[PDB]
Amino acid sequence: EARDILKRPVITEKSSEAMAEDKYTFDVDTRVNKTQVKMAVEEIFNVKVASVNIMNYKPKKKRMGRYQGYTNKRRKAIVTLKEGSIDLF
Amino acid sequence: AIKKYKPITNGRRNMTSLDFAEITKTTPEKSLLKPLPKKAGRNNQGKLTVRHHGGGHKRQYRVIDFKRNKDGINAKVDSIQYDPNRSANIALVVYADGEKRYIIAPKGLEVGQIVESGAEADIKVGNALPLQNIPVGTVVHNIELKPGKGGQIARSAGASAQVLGKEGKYVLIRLRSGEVRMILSTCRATIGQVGNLQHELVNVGKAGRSRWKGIRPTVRGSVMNPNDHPHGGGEGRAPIGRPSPMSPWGKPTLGKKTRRGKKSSDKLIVRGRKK
Amino acid sequence: VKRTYQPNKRKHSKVHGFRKRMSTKNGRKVLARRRRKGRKVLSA
RNA sequence: UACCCUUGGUCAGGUUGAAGUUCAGGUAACACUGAAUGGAGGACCGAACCGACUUACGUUGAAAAGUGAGCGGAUGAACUG
RNA sequence: GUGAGUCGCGAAAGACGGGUGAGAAUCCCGUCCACCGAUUGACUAAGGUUUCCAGAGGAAGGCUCGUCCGCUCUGGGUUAGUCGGGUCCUAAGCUGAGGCCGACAGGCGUAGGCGAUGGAUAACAGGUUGAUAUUCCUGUACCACCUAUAAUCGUUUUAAUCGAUGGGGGGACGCAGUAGGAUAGGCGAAGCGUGCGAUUGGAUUGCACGUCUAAGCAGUAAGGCUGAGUAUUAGGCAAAUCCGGUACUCGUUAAGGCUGAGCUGUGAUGGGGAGAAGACAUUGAGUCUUCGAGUCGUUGAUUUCACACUGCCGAGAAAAGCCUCUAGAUAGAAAAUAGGUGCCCGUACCGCAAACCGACACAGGUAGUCAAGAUGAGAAUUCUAAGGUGAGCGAGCGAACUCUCGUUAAGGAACUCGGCAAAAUGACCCCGUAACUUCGGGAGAAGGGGUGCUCUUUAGGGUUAACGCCCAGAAGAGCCGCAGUGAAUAGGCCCAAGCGACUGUUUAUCAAAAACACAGGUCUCUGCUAAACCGUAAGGUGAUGUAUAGGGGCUGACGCCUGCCCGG
Ligand SMILES: [Mg+2]
Ligand SMILES: [Mg+2]
Ligand SMILES: [Mg+2]
Ligand SMILES: [Mg+2]
Ligand SMILES: [Mg+2]
Ligand SMILES: [Mg+2]
Ligand SMILES: [Mg+2]
Ligand SMILES: [Mg+2]
Ligand SMILES: [Mg+2]
Ligand SMILES: [Mg+2]
Ligand SMILES: [O]
Ligand SMILES: [O]
Ligand SMILES: [O]
Ligand SMILES: [O]
């Protein structure tokens, strides 16, 4: 379902330029094919073609209390549009 | 024949090698071939058992019908070819039926000569047929010891056996190695010496030409240190101290007999001359 | 010089890896000690 | 690191000029002759690459075995991923 | 703590100005200078794992200082139907149902299966960010597939038509050598833009630029067809119109029949690219809307593009894709058209290095691709483009002493264990070149000579319609300086002897040799699941081998030779 396929949004200067050609940037739950995102984001907003591109990221390090630990895995997915547009801000 | 090579430098002086006058084509039939990795003289395991092999050049398997199994059907011979893995040069054979099979080359074979595999195939060179029917006083190659296997005998370069005579069952034969054996009456064989005769006058000429084959070096025993070989050790050079010159594994070489006298064919063996 | 340990993955996620160990008696025993002793890593 | 296997990659430039071929020469016919062709060699110089011969240096060192000047092999039993 | 504020501060060319800041030889900016340039350059693999970029900070780290960093803190960055890989194949090898063996463990091994450094496989150019690019957009392309639509099929036979899990073809491979056809880039010009010097002089005079894809239509330089076509079939396990064979008509006619292929022409591209201040309200007027405007001809030419051809022999992976043949499936397709559908991994950065291995920000190693200019045979050498760097302590003085380089009259190995080292020779051409010899060589023997720029005259060869463009000789005549391959890179030689025949390998980190091996010789073993061997045994090597073959010992090219003793 949409819920466990879209975990977060993302915003930044990168996405800000991205919204010129009607692009967007979400972060998903991991272990999700590219295609489920298409049909599911379609299911939830009725926006569509301009198919998806996607990446991963390896987890960095961090020290907040002088103990070692890693950040969390991050699979980022870049959505782009041809059919209207969506704003939820 | 063997063509001496003019000395131009040190590593050719005694050199010698073949002329290749019994060849018609160079590139083989794709079909009968079959591939061949190498092992360098060592086991399913990986350990070295036989010494000094490997290092050589790549090659393939040219299949042979040593059985000459299909009988009666006349054949012809439209080509010769070369065979690395044996001294004996090799022939290709268009059977009557369109089949194609390679056979070791008898000396004095003519391309276009025809050769048979049958009982009623009267005697010439090449023809394949049993021992019982053959006359006495004849030279024969590629005998089988057993019906239907594929021959094991006189299969290398040069001449071949002699038939001295026959009972009904079994049948005599004298080899080269000059040694005698009773053979079955019905084993399939053929007639005529083998091809290449001057494979042995080859002065290999230079060290590499053993590696090209390939084989590789063998080190003496009176050089090593005494663990690795019994003769070894010794200040300076090394006379062999002990009697009975030994292998690396004990077990002498020089005169000792290793035929195991319980083997069943020891009755078939008479008049042991060469060994 | 080229010193020992010119490193690589495949020869190290092979031999000292898991499925070798847990595809051999002795290796299973090895793992038993690296569990009984407590460790944060195996196959390394 | 040592061997071995399967599979790939590499080796500037130049010099020498065998077998054989062929043109005439020449014999009864072959041997043999002189040219032109042809381009073999664990062939010759010599950079990459490899190696470690002599020497100096360093020798709580730049380095737990190298550097600089020279040195040998470099189409082969070569080198190496 | 002592040693000691002592050794060291890890090859190297920096200087000045202007800013900043509390504070600067070390930070930013610029100008100059110097360095590499078959590279200290550019691109990727292995490898490491966020080191990448922005904004702040300077407690410790940095071998100094530090306002800075590859250190800290916060935030942020890696986009694929076509790229490397998987949904395709396979060798070596690994695992291996049943199974054979073993005291247990477990060991062997068929079927099959995994496993690439190889085989097949649909994409290109530009633009763009502080940080991503064949991934984004911009344009132009391709493959498979589904859906929709019709010009051909007609027992579901055979025919259009699908087609193997089986049969066949090809895929499919060595090494060396020469020659050739094409382009890459380079070259010097009479086409384009800018600009005329303040040092005597010069004005066709100086400087820079000289392109455009993959894809689709045509052709195409060189090669190939032991050939084309028919009929039959003792075979390719069953079948076969396919293969293979066999007999004939046409063959060497090359007609060019068929095949494959460098690359070229055209469009793609009235487009992108671009030397371009001659462009502003403007941005620091740098800058941007903005218009500027060119594709010519020559010569040179690979180490790139066909293991193609020839030669040699040491006789040169496999399977799949791909194309066919039937057994068979099955009513009966789809030409070219429109539309859509197209997964996972990786992608940042360094990658002859500060980030990899080396405990260090270490003078080491670290496969592969590109590799320009003059000089040169040349990837050699010297100096420079492209571009990158100034090496993470410096300022003084200019003593010993050590090290590294240069020189030294007279003599010239007297030093010395020993001419160790250092110096001398060194390139091209010409003359010439002994002994001995296994006739190949020795032999670059030795020794000896010439080489610069200008002017004149002349041979020439390749390339062209020709012009001129290139290439490298001879002859004379002159000029200069001590010196003409003016610097740099590049053999020291002769005679005699022992040992070894070679060339080769060896004691990784004290020995590279007269040792080891080597082709050859010789003796003995071994009649074939042969001997020997690893193992407990199966099993496997030997060996796709079959006594002109395989194992063991000894000796070491050549040629002269290989004596006596069989008691131990
Ligand atoms: Mg050399
Ligand atoms: Mg200053
Ligand atoms: Mg083949
Ligand atoms: Mg050929
Ligand atoms: Mg990686
Ligand atoms: Mg380094
Ligand atoms: Mg150059
Ligand atoms: Mg003198
Ligand atoms: Mg003297
Ligand atoms: Mg021998
Ligand atoms: O050489
Ligand atoms: O050399
Ligand atoms: O050499
Ligand atoms: O050489």
Taking the CA atoms of B236, B237, B243 and B247 in sequence, report the sign of the dihedral they define.
positive
CA pair distance C44, C30, nearest whole angstrom: 12
Token pair belonging to B184 = 């079955």
Token pair belonging to A8 = 């977060």
Q: Report the separation in Å between the CA atom of B211 and the middle of ligand 11, taken as the mean of its atom positions.
A: 25
Kindly report the number of other CB atoms within 10 A of residue B139's CB atom: 16
Q: Report the separation in Å between the CA atom of B36 and the middle of ligand 1, taken as the mean of its atom positions.
A: 38
Amino acid at the residue A73: K
Give the number of residues written for chain B.
275
Which among A45, A39, A48, A36 is positioned nearest to A86, based on CA atoms? A45
Give the number of residues written for chain C.
44
Strand D CB shell (< 7 Å): B 3, 6, 8-12, 37-40, 54-56, 58, 206-208, 211-212, 214, 216-217; C 1-2
DSSP B7: P
- CA distances in angstroms from B122 to B74, B126, B129, B130, C16, listed in the order given: 12, 11, 9, 11, 69
Question: Which phi-psi region, left, alpha or beta, contains residue B233 (left: φ > 0; alpha: ψ -120 to 50)?
Answer: left
Residue B46 CA from chain centroid, whole number? 27
- CA distances in angstroms from B179 to A12, B1, B92, B182, B268, listed in the order given: 96, 29, 32, 11, 11
CA pair distance B246, B149, nearest whole angstrom: 37
Q: How many CA atoms lie within 13 A of A26 on its CB side?
A: 20
Counting Cβ atoms within 10 Å, is residue B160 exposed (0-12), middle (13-18) or buried (19+)? Answer: buried
CA pair distance B3, B15, nearest whole angstrom: 9
Whether residue B144 contacts residue B171, with contact meaning beta carbons closer than 8 Å, is answered with: no
Residues 6+ away with beta carbon under 8 Å from B172: B163, B164, B165, B166, B180, B181, B182, B183
Kindly report the number of other CB atoms within 10 A of residue A83's CB atom: 13
Amino acid at the residue B158: G
Token pair belonging to C10 = 């495949």
Nearest nucleotide by C1' from B83 CA?
Answer: E315
Strand D footprint nucleotides (protein C-beta < 7 Å): 1, 3-7, 18-19, 40-43, 65-66, 76-78
The reply to whether B188 has its C-beta less than 7 Å from any atom of strand E is no
Largest CA distance in chain C: 41
Nearest nucleotide by C1' from C6 CA?
Answer: E357
Whether residue B231 contacts residue B221, with contact meaning beta carbons closer than 8 Å, is answered with: yes
CA pair distance A53, A43, nearest whole angstrom: 18
Set out the domains of chain A in order of their start, with CATH numbers: 1-89 (3.30.70.330)
Kindly report the number of other CB atoms within 10 A of residue B27's CB atom: 6
CA pair distance A53, A34, nearest whole angstrom: 8
Whether residue B210 contacts residue B202, with contact meaning beta carbons closer than 8 Å, is answered with: no
Residues 6+ away with beta carbon under 8 Å from B117: B68, B69, B70, B71, B72, B73, B75, B127, B128, B129
Place of tokens 């019905």: B186
Counting Cβ atoms within 10 Å, is residue B258 exposed (0-12), middle (13-18) or buried (19+)? Answer: exposed
The reply to whether B32 has its C-beta less than 7 Å from any atom of strand E is no
Element (H, E) at B211: helix B208-211
Token pair belonging to A81 = 């549009």
Resolution of the experimental structure, in angstroms: 3.8
Check residues 1 to 20 of chain A and report those whose beta carbon is under 7 Å from nucleic acid strand E.
Answer: 10, 12-15
CA pair distance A6, C11, nearest whole angstrom: 39
Residues 6+ away with beta carbon under 8 Å from B241: B231, B234
Place of tokens 């059907």: B73
DSSP B97: T
What does the angle CA B182 – CA B154 – CA B191 come to, to the nearest 5 degrees?
A: 85
- CA distances in angstroms from B211 to A53, B18, B42, B206, C42, listed in the order given: 58, 18, 18, 10, 47
Å between CA of B184 and C1' of E17? 112
Strand E footprint nucleotides (protein C-beta < 7 Å): 46-51, 72-74, 76-81, 91-94, 105-106, 108-109, 130-131, 135-138, 169-170, 172, 226, 233-235, 243-246, 313-318, 340-347, 356-358, 364-366, 438-440, 501-503, 515-520, 523-529, 531-534, 539-558, 568
Whether residue B242 contacts residue B230, with contact meaning beta carbons closer than 8 Å, is answered with: yes
Taking the CA atoms of B210, B216, B222 and B224 in sequence, report the sign of the dihedral they define.
positive
Token pair belonging to B43 = 């086991």
Which among B190, B184, B154 is positioned nearest to B166, based on CA atoms? B184
Whether residue B131 contacts residue B187, with contact meaning beta carbons closer than 8 Å, is answered with: yes
Taking the CA atoms of B34, B37, B43 and B44 in sequence, report the sign of the dihedral they define.
negative
Element (H, E) at C25: helix C25-36
Residues 6+ away with beta carbon under 8 Å from B165: B136, B172
* DSSP reduced 3-state for C32: helix
CA pair distance B149, C18, nearest whole angstrom: 49
Counting Cβ atoms within 10 Å, is residue B78 exposed (0-12), middle (13-18) or buried (19+)? Answer: middle
CA pair distance B143, B161, nearest whole angstrom: 9
What DSSP string describes A12-45? SHHHHHHTTTTEEEEE--SS--HHHHHHHHHHHH
* DSSP reduced 3-state for A11: coil
Residues 6+ away with beta carbon under 8 Å from B118: B71, B72, B73, B127, B128, B129
Which among B96, B86, B98, B99 is positioned nearest to B142, based on CA atoms? B86
The terminus-to-terminus CA distance of chain B in angstroms comes to: 30
